[PDB]
């Protein structure tokens, strides 16, 4: 089965997406989770090679979370995902 946890994530929408390097884009991502849900905004940080993916429903945060739980890998490239703030 599974081991279980439970982060800090109680009423947080946004996702933080870590690994995206040149190779990844903002658009790559926006249309990856905009598949779950509408996407408030997205902050990618080139600087720090991630992204931060908002939802206006918490619904499709939580969905594209876990999916997005070391699950997340786009062009061939795995990308660390954990909940933000």
């Not at 599974?2 to 933080?16: F, H, R």
């Not at 918490?58 to 699950?71: D, I, L, M, T, Y």
């Amino acid at each position: 089965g599974s081991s279980g946890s439970s982060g800090e994530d109680k009423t947080i929408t946004t996702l933080y997406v870590g690994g995206l390097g040149d190779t990844i884009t903002e658009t790559d991502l926006r249309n990856h989770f905009y598949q779950f849900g509408e996407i408030r905004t997205i902050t990618v940080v080139q600087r720090q090679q991630c992204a931060f993916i908002q939802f206006a429903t918490r619904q499709a945060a939580e969905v594209a979370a876990e999916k997005s739980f070391n699950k997340l890998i786009v062009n061939g490239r795995r990308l660390n995902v954990k909940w933000g703030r």
